[PDB]
Amino acid sequence: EPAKIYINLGVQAPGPFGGGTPEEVAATLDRVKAAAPGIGIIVDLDEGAGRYTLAEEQAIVDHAKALGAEICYHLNLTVFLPTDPVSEEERAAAKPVWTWTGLHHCIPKEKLLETLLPQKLDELEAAFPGKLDYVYLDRLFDGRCYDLTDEEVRYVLDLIKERGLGIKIESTKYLDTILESGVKVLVDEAVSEKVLDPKLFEKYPDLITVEVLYESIETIERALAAGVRNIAIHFGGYGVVSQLDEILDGVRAITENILALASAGS
């Protein structure tokens, strides 16, 4: 219920553009922690971008977990049928969808939730045993393949509660059902700016963490005024080292922001 501040670091593998090597990610996390040892860190893993090997992700997660950071991971569910096209009532069960790569057939909603989603979570826990804190379910909750019933949503939220995981959401479509099940939620930046506000902050304060892009004192002031109790603050930058420059500047500016707000509320 007391207000808490978190520093959000986006971590993706090197590509022609930005990203960061495992060594750069570890070096950045060490400097960020040294700059604000009293502020939590949330690592947004896997978010023209490169990809990590599994061993690289494991080394990154191990280093961040040892520092005490929380990890948000992209589950990256396969929701399109095993490329082999389908010819029967499976066609009636596989919703045809056109993406940037043409026609695809969604995996039947029953087979995904029953066997494929729990297996993906089991493979996830086997690779990062007890080291993940939030999971991203874009293709499941906000994809063009599935419209989950309220019963199916609670079944999913039960699958990640069993693994001790929260969820990072890109939309408010299932928000109220998310808090009702008592799962931790990480609200992405530009979710409302892309309607739900105060009521849940007063209802479930310790369940909601809102990620905001820092601009000025108004960023922290508006979040506190709206009732947010956990504010994950993302700074500018693209690669991990470029984010480090913005974070180190932002830690100094945010200290002045909180100090000025404290004198006004005194």
Residue numbers in the entry: 3 to 49, 66 to 212, 221 to 292
Task: Share the article's original sentences.
Here, we present a strategy for the de novo design of a simplified scaffold of an endo-α-N-acetylgalactosaminidase active site, a glycoside hydrolase from the GH101 enzyme family. Using a combination of trRosetta hallucination, iterative cycles of deep-learning-based structure prediction, and ProteinMPNN sequence design, we designed proteins with 290 amino acids incorporating the active site while reducing the molecular weight by over 100 kDa compared to the initial endo-α-N-acetylgalactosaminidase.
All three structures aligned with an RMSD of 1.0 Å or less, revealing a common (β/α)8-barrel organization with an overall fold similar to the hallucinated model. Specifically, loop regions ranging from Gly50-Gly65 and Glu210-Val220 were poorly defined or lacked electron density (insert I and II), correlating with regions displaying increased dynamics in the molecular dynamics simulations and low pLDDT confidence score. The specifically restrained catalytic residues exhibited a Cα RMSD of 1.2 Å across 31 atoms relative to the OmegaFold model and 2.0 Å over 34 atoms relative to the EngBF enzyme crystal structure (inserts). Notably, His53 and Asp57 were excluded from this analysis due to their location within a loop region for which electron density was lacking (insert I). Additionally, key catalytic residues, Glu188 and Asp156, corresponding to the catalytic acid/base and nucleophile, respectively, were found to be positioned within 3.4 Å, compared to the 4.2 Å separation observed in EngBF.
